[PDB]
Amino acid sequence: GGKVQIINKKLDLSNVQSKCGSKDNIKHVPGGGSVQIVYKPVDLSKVTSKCGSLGNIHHKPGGGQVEVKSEKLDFKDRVQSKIGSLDNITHVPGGGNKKIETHKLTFR
Amino acid sequence: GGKVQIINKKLDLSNVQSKCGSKDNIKHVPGGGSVQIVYKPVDLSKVTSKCGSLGNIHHKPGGGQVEVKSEKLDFKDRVQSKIGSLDNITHVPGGGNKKIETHKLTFR
Amino acid sequence: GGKVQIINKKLDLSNVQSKCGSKDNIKHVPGGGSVQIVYKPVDLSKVTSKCGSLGNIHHKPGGGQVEVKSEKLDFKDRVQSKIGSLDNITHVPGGGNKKIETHKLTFR
Amino acid sequence: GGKVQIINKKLDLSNVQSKCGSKDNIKHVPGGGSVQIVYKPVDLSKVTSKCGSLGNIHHKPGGGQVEVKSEKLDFKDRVQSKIGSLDNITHVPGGGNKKIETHKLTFR
Amino acid sequence: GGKVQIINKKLDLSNVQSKCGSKDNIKHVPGGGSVQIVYKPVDLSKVTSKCGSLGNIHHKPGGGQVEVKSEKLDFKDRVQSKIGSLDNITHVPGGGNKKIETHKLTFR
Numbered sequence: 001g002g003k004v005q006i007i008n009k010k011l012d013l014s015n016v017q018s019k020c021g022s023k024d025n026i027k028h029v030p031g032g033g034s035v036q037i038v039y040k041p042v043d044l045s046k047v048t049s050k051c052g053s054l055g056n057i058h059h060k061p062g063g064g065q066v067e068v069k070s071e072k073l074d075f076k077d078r079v080q081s082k083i084g085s086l087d088n089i090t091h092v093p094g095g096g097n098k099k100i101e102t103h104k105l106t107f108r
Numbered sequence: 109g110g111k112v113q114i115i116n117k118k119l120d121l122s123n124v125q126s127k128c129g130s131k132d133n134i135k136h137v138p139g140g141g142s143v144q145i146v147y148k149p150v151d152l153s154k155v156t157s158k159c160g161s162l163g164n165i166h167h168k169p170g171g172g173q174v175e176v177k178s179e180k181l182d183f184k185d186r187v188q189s190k191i192g193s194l195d196n197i198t199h200v201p202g203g204g205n206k207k208i209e210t211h212k213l214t215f216r
Numbered sequence: 217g218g219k220v221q222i223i224n225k226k227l228d229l230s231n232v233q234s235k236c237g238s239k240d241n242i243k244h245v246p247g248g249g250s251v252q253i254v255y256k257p258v259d260l261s262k263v264t265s266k267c268g269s270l271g272n273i274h275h276k277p278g279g280g281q282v283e284v285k286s287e288k289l290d291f292k293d294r295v296q297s298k299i300g301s302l303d304n305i306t307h308v309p310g311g312g313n314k315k316i317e318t319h320k321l322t323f324r
Numbered sequence: 325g326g327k328v329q330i331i332n333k334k335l336d337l338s339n340v341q342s343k344c345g346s347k348d349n350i351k352h353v354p355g356g357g358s359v360q361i362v363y364k365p366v367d368l369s370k371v372t373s374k375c376g377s378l379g380n381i382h383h384k385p386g387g388g389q390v391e392v393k394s395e396k397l398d399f400k401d402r403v404q405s406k407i408g409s410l411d412n413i414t415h416v417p418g419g420g421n422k423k424i425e426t427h428k429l430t431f432r
Numbered sequence: 433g434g435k436v437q438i439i440n441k442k443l444d445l446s447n448v449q450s451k452c453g454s455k456d457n458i459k460h461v462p463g464g465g466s467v468q469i470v471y472k473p474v475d476l477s478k479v480t481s482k483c484g485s486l487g488n489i490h491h492k493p494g495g496g497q498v499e500v501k502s503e504k505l506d507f508k509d510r511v512q513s514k515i516g517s518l519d520n521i522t523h524v525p526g527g528g529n530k531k532i533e534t535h536k537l538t539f540r
Contacts, residue, residue: 001109003112003329004112005113005330006332007331007332008114008117009115009117009334010119010335011118011119011160011332011334011336012338013120013159014121014123014337015123015338015340016157017123017125017126017343018126018156018341018343019125019129020345021129021345021346022130022345022347022349023130023131023132023344023346024131024132024133024349025130025133025348025350025351026134026349026350026351026363027134027135028137028352028353028354029137029350029354029355030136030139030355030415030417030525031143031354031357031358031415032355033413034141034142034143034194034358034407034410035139035142035358035359036358037147037359038361038362038364038405039134039145039149039363040148040149040363040403041150041366042149042150042366042397043150043151043153043261044368045153045370046369046371047156047370048156048157048371048373049156049157049158049340049341050158050373050374050375050377051340051375052159052332052376052377053160054161054163054377054379055378055380056163056166056380057112057163058166058380059110059112059169059384060167060169060382060387060389061110061170061383061384062386062387063169063171063172063389064388065171065172065174066173068176068392069394070176070179070392071179071396072178072396072397073150073181073183073396073397073398074180074183075397075399075400075401076401077148077186078184079188080189080404080406081406082190082407083141083142083190083191083194084191085192085195085408086194086410086413087411087413088195088197088210088212088411088413089194089197089198089210089248089413090197090198090200090209090413090414091138091248091413091414091415091416091417092201092208092415093199093246094205094416094417094419094420094525094527095203095204096203096205096420097418097419097420097424098206098421098422099207100425101211101424102209102412102425102426103211103425103426103427104211104212105429105430106216106430107429108216108432109217110219110277111218111219111220111221112219112221113222114221116227116268118225120228122229124232125234126234126235126263126265127235128261129237129239130238130241131238131239131240132241133240133241133242134245135241138244138246139247139248139251140415141249141250141302142249142251142252143245143250145251145252145253145255147242147254147257148256149258151257151258151259151260152260153261156265157264159267161267161270162271163270163380164271164274165220165222165272165273169218169277169278170278171277171278172279173276173279173283174282174283175283176283178284178285178287178288179287180287181258181289181291182291183258183291185292185293185294186295187254187256187295187296189252189254189297190296190297190299191249191298194249194301194302195302196304196318196320197302197304197306197307197318198306198307198316199305199308200307200308200309200310200313200316201246201307202313202417202419203310203311203313204310204311205313206314206315207314208313208315210318210319214323214324216323216324328435328436329435329436329437330440330489331438333440334442334443335442335443337484338445339447339448341449342450342451343449343450344451344452345453346455348455348457349454349457350459351457351460352459353458353460353469354463354467354523355467356465356521357518358466360468360469361469362470362471362513363471364509365471365474366505367473368476369452369479370478370479371450371452371479371480372450373449374481375448375483375484376443376483376485377485378485378487378489379488379489380488381488382492383491385491385493387492387495387496388495388497392500393501394502394504395502395504396502396504396505397504397505398508399505399509400509402510403509403510403512404512405513405514407514407515407516409516409517410466410517410518410521411517411519411520413520413521415521415525416523417524418525418526418527421530421532425532426522426534428536430538431538431539431540
């Protein structure tokens with residue numbers, strides 16, 4: 001037969017917190033001619049807080065059970081970022097700048 | 109036969125929090141000519157708070173059960189970002205800038 | 217036979233919170249000539265708060281049950297962003313800027 | 325037969341915290357001509373806090389159970405970032421700069 | 433038969449913390465012509481705090497169970513960052529700079 005008996009009496013549990021913040025952040029990236037960002041993170045992380053908890057309760061004596069838990073990820077991505085040419089560019093993302101000049105003269 | 113018995117008496121549980129914030133953020137990316145962002149994150153993360161909880165209760169003695177939990181992801185994406193040419197560009201995303209100039213002269 | 221017995225008495229549960237905010241945010245991306253964003257996130261994440269809860273209760277002694285839980289995602293996307301040419305562009309998304317000029321002279 | 329008996333009485337559990345912050349952050353990357361970022365992190369990390377908790381309870385005497393937990397990730401990504409040429413670029417993301425000039429003269 | 437008996441009485445557990453911060457951070461990388469970052473970290477780390485907790489409870493006397501826990505990662509990524517040429521670039525991400533000049537003269 002078998003028996004799985006769990007008794008819980010007079011439990012006072014409190015202040016269980018799980019926080020994730022500013023994860024995988026790309027900030028303040030200025031490019032004078034161009035910015036090329038290929039942003040492909042694969043995230044299977046865990047931020048877990050457990051307090052007075054239990055897992056799965058399985059009672060299977062003498063069983064021919066087949067339990068399969070599968071998780072398959074296939075990545076065959078094909079990403080192409082292409083720019084032919086850039087010239088004669090003034091980029092001022094800063095503040096309070098004076099007399100910013102770019103000159104290009106061609107003679108043939 | 110078997111038995112799965114769970115008794116819970118006089119439980120005071122409180123302040124269970126799970127927070128996710130500013131995840132995968134791309135901020136402040138100025139490009140003088142161009143910005144090319146391919147933004148393909150794959151997210152299977154967990155932010156979990158458990159307090160006085162339990163898992164699945166399974167009572168299957170002597171069973172020939174087949175339990176399959178499958179999760180398949182296939183990625184064959186084909187992304188192309190293309191720009192032929194850029195020239196003669198003034199970009200001022202900043203504040204309070206004076207006398208920002210770009211000159212291009214061609215003589216043939 | 218078997219038995220799954222659960223007793224819950226005098227439970228005071230409170231303040232169970234699950235928050236997701238500002239996730240996958242793209243902000244402040246100025247481009248002088250162009251901005252090309254391919255925004256394809258795949259999100260299967262979990263932000264979960266459990267307090268005094270339980271999972272599924274299964275009572276299947278001696279059963280030949282077949283239980284399949286499948287989740288299939290196929291991605292064969294074909295995205296193309298193309299721009300032929302750009303020139304002679306003044307872009308001022310900033311504030312309080314003075315004398316921003318772009319000049320292009322061609323002589324053949 | 326067998327028996328799995330768990331007794332929990334008069335448990336006061338509190339202040340269980342799990343925090344993840346500013347993980348995998350790329351900040352302040354200015355490029356004079358170009359910035360090329362290929363951002364593909366694979367994250368299976370754990371930030372876990374356990375307090376008065378237990379794992380899975382399995383009661384399977386004399387069983388021919390087959391339990392498979394699989395997790396397969398395949399990465400065959402093909403990412404190409406290409407730029408043909410850059411010249412004659414002034415990039416001032418700083419503040420309070422004066423007399424920033426770039427000159428290019430060509431004579432044939 | 434067998435028996436797994438666990439008694440827990442009068443447990444006061446508190447202040448269980450697990451923190452991860454500023455992990456894998458790339459900051460302040462200015463490039464005069466270009467910045468090329470291939471950012472592919474593989475993270476399977478653990479930041480764990482355990483307080484008054486236990487592991488999995490398995491009661492399987494005389495069982496022919498097959499328990500497989502597999503975790504396979506395959507990386508065949510092909511990343512190419514290519515730039516043909518750069519010249520005549522002024523990059524001033526600093527503050528309060530005066531008289532920054534770049535001159536290029538060509539005569540054939």
